[PDB]
Design a protein around this nucleic acid. Structure first.
Ligand SMILES: [Zn+2]
Lengths: 60, 206, 261, 98
RNA sequence: UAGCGCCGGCCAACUCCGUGCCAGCAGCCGCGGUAAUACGGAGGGCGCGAGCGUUACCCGGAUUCACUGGGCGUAAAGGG
RNA sequence: UGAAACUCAAAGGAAUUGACGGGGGCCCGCACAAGCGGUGGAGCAUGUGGUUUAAUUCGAAGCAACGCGAAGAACCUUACCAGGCCUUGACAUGCUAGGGAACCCGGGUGAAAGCCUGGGGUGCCCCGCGAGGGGAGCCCUAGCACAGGUGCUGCAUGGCCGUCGUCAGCUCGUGCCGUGAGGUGUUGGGUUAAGUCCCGCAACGAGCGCAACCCCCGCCGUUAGUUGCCAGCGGUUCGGCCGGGCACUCUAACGGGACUGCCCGCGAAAGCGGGAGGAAGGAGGGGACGACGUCUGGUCAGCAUGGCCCUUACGGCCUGGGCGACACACGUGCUACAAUGCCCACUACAAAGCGAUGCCACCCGGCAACGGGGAGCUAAUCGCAAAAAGGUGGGCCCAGUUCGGAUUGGGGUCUGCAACCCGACCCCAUGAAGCCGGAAUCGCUAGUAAUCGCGGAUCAGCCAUGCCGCGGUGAAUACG
């Protein structure tokens, strides 16, 4: 999650299968969700904050 | 321990989402990124005026930003100059003819974020933590607010070992859904590190 | 903190949304907070670095209060009134003052010819008596003459020692000084007017002649002129010195200097 | 407006409060005197009355302490008949003398 | 001609520099290992003043030999 | 009978709060017991300890680390190693010493990064006369600030998480008791999942807790009938396929309903054992929910941040390797050791999900994975999608076997710029140990265990037997 790596993951890397996703909030490259583009930790924080529309605590 | 977010616990009922809009899977993440950028900019700029809440809604390629501020004059500025330049900045950020709105929070002692940021500001000014917390809880308790609670994290008064302070008064039932508990977080950056301030306020029931 | 008594002082000042208020040495901001809720604009002069964070924090919920970090003496008050009070009719000064800077801080404001309406302050009871003194009450002196020549004075009440949590050594009193419409008495020779006023009370228990001739080398040379002018102005250096009214001093400051000016 | 269950809880609370605090509801302020059937069974009550300089009237019996009671009626505390007689006479006197 | 003691609590009189369990202070409780009102020096203050402190000794505080004026079940104290 | 010299600033008595006992008593919980399945034996998958290594990047360490961070290591990820290169640098705001402000094409060098570079520049931007000229348009290399760091301390911290523990406790106001610390409330009997209630009692209440409010499932109503449903009606080419209707199922909003509510008996009371009614009866089943605090618990490698350190390298880019090694040991799993079984055909019955670079119906070719055509679908419309165990028919006959399914040889497909290190899925060859596993040990009380399939996140593809959900068939025992 170095600044350099963050910036490097935003250029067309000469090949199709080199580009990978990073957390748009913290540059995490481990557990990003494609639907949101946020890592699990950032997802949880924003979900709790109520800043994610339509997302709530699941219970069944 | 490990209490969960008192707002996230009540997103369905007694509270509401800060962002209210719809987007399909194709164009969800982009709107969220724009939204986060807007929030960042607003927090950065309007901090002086005492921001407490930012609401974003979308109808059709439009943005209706509502800012809840203790002091609306600062935001508006003289002859509506500052509000206009802020609108210009936001519109330049994203070409979506944004429609900024300003509301004044009634009785600014009854908003938990305001209380939290005030306590953090006090801590930054090398105040006495315990006394400040007691006074803050007292002021919240004065103007209704059936329950009040303030927590300051640790590293008190440039000490070596961290410790929690916690002054509270009244009913703060974190276990009840129909509580209408207003919550606020703040971060106080001092020369000996960072401190966390949390404020809970309890405004009746149902 | 002195509770509702603060709200009392402002009550004796009668400020509203019409008025702008100048605060001198606010301190914590006990009086400033009370003034803020009742005044359209509040301005403050604070020069102590240690009390600044506390004062700022106390003023956090408010917006119509401005604090300028500069000593009153050095700063031009006229300009501050010009900007800060562009949109208010009545301009008033409410303050509580440190013991050393009590009179000179008043004198600076009075000398500057500010558009101030009234100065309602808390001072020493002794100083309050001296400022507002009837003739031959042993309180009559340079202070009384000067103030009443500039501004009409009125002591409201006496604040007892048994108010402040740290009990002081001397009691306090609240006074009002309303700026008169123009000089009280017509005399062009303001400087020598004040010279005469201060010289006449050089020795309180002495006579006018003693307090006149002893002062000033020319005066100590030309004795007879003083006497003949005094008799010209229908005054004599025998009565006491402390029994004279302001207009009498006006007549003397006209005549005596008219002899040599 | 409430979950029935909540109404049931409130009703139980009301029932308990009604059971214990009935009659006592008429005291808007501290009483003027006090009337005790048995001063020994009612040691706490007598002591509380003493502490607040309130006159004490008792229907004391053999196993009682006559010193703690100002106005004492030496009689039976059992024997339902005696309770009825004394209380009836007292209440009649109160009602008549109003 | 104006000195002498003191300024942590007893006990009236507070800050800045030097040292860092060292040098030292000390009537008792105790202060001294880097933010010392307790050590050393300054500024300031307090008490007395041709004097002010220290040591020694006696009475007091000591109802701590109790006649005024104490106690003995478990605190020292009922005899095998 | 009975000293003193010397030392110390205490030595003591009663009682209070807590800690601890290997002091005792009471209660609870798959803790033991009664059962059903496993683990430890074997093969393989994966994570650790060790060892080799150029590096085998790090953090995690009893329960509460060990299918953990990692919901996706062939390059990228990547933080480690070996080489090949750059120094205001990928990225930020500036400062101002000549381009001159600007974009595009192209060659040598070549493992690539980078380096050296030549030609059309894109020039105007106002328009001083204008014939170069003032710059807000834009970019190269030269000036200083500075970028930066997965470099180090979780024993400087914030945030968030784990655990005791969803255990039932942790406190306060006023009153009363005690000279005082303090106590009572909160202790005693009974009962409960529970300081949950009841009685007694100098307490009477409240706050954080338990409970309830919230969600799903179980029943019945109004609202509404498409892309869903089909009792009668008319159609039928046999398909709710058609006209038709929203009765029924269903879909999703608002409601009702269960509260010891009503009768019998016991009990002082809370309640207790039965009985109606009811879809459901004593908390109906499940979830979300985690008090004061404990563990110097965990994370400076998600992020923020105090402090220390490097700034021609501990920063930055690229190529190749490693994280996948291997005499061994430990953990969590998967597949079996067979006849209540194995293989082969025919035939059924679900729920919850996902999809416009995608899902792929249908056709053809290939034995096969797949390839080529190709509709339909932003989807209660189309598709993935055959559900599997099951039921019927046939074979197999106790044999390391038509049980197993490792390892090896060859051929073929797709993803990808590239499958050697190290991808998956195929087709033909061989057929490994393994005949129910010692001491010990783990889970589970009901739609549960056991067993059987399906979907999803991550993701070009996948080393997933993992994780999070969905349903199908459905035991036993709980004396204590
Ligand atoms: Zn993130």
């Amino acid at each position: 999650a170095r600044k350099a790596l963050i910036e490097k993951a935003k250029r067309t890397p000469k090949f199709k299968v080199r580009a990978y996703t990073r957390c748009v909030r913290c540059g995490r490259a481990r557990s990003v969700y494609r639907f949101f583009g946020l890592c699990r930790i950032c997802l949880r924080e924003l979900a709790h904050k109520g800043q994610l529309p339509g997302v709530r605590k699941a219970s069944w | 321990g490990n209490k969960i977010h008192p707002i996230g616990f009540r997103l369905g009922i007694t509270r509401d989402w800060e962002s209210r809009w719809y987007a399909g899977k194709k164009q969800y993440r982009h709107l969220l990124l724009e939204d986060q950028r807007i929030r960042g900019l607003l927090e950065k700029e309007l901090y002086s005026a005492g921001l407490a809440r930012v609401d974003i809604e979308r109808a059709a390629d439009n943005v209706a930003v509502t800012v809840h501020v203790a002091k609306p004059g600062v935001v508006i500025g003289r002859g509506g100059e500052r509000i206009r330049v802020l609108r210009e900045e936001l519109a330049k950020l994203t070409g979506k003819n944004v429609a900024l709105n300003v509301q004044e929070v009634q009785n600014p002692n009854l908003s938990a974020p305001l209380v939290a940021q005030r306590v953090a500001e006090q801590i930054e000014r090398r105040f006495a933590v315990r006394r400040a917390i007691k006074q803050a809880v007292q002021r919240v308790m004065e103007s209704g607010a059936k329950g009040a609670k303030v927590i300051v994290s640790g590293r008190i008064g440039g000490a070596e070992q961290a410790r929690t302070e916690w002054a509270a008064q009244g009913r703060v039932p974190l276990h009840t859904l129909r509580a209408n508990i207003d919550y606020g977080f703040a971060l106080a950056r001092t020369t000996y590190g960072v401190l966390g301030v949390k404020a809970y306020i309890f405004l009746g029931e149902v | 903190i002195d509770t509702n008594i603060l709200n009392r002082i402002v009550d004796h000042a009668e400020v509203t949304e019409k008025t702008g208020v100048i605060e001198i040495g606010p301190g914590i901001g006990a009086l400033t907070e009370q003034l803020a809720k009742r005044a359209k604009k509040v301005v403050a002069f604070e020069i102590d670095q240690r009390l600044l964070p506390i004062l700022k924090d106390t003023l956090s919920p408010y917006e119509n209060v401005t604090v300028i970090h500069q000593d009153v003496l050095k700063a031009d008050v006229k300009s501050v009134i010009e900007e800060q009070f562009q949109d208010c009719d009545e301009i008033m000064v409410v303050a509580n003052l440190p013991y050393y800077v009590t009179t000179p801080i008043i004198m600076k404001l009075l000398e500057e010819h500010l558009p101030l309406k009234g100065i309602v302050v808390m001072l020493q009871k002794e100083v309050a008596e001296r400022m507002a003194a009837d003739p031959s009450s042993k309180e009559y002196g340079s202070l009384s003459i000067a103030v009443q020549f500039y501004t009409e004075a009125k002591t409201v009440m006496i604040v007892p020692k048994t108010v402040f949590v740290p009990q002081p050594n001397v009691d306090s009193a609240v006074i009002r000084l309303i700026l008169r419409d123009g000089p009280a008495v017509d005399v062009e020779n303001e400087s020598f007017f004040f010279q005469l006023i201060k010289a006449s009370f050089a020795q309180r228990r002495k006579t006018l002649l003693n307090n006149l001739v002893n002062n000033l080398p020319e005066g100590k040379a030309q004795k007879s002129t003083i006497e003949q002018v005094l008799e010209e102005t229908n005054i004599d250096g025998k009565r006491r010195g402390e029994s004279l009214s302001i207009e009498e001093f006006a007549a003397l400051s006209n005549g005596l200097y008219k002899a040599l000016f | 407006e409430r979950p029935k269950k909540e109404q049931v809880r409130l009703k139980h609370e009301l029932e308990r409060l009604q059971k214990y605090l009935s009659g006592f509801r008429l005291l808007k302020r501290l009483p003027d005197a006090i009337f005790v059937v048995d001063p020994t069974k009612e040691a706490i009550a007598v002591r509380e009355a003493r502490k607040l300089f309130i006159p004490v009237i008792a229907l004391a019996d053999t196993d009682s302490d006559p010193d703690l009671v100002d106005y004492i009626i030496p009689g039976n505390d059992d024997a339902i008949r005696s309770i009825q007689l004394i209380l009836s006479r007292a209440v009649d006197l109160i009602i008549q003398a109003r």
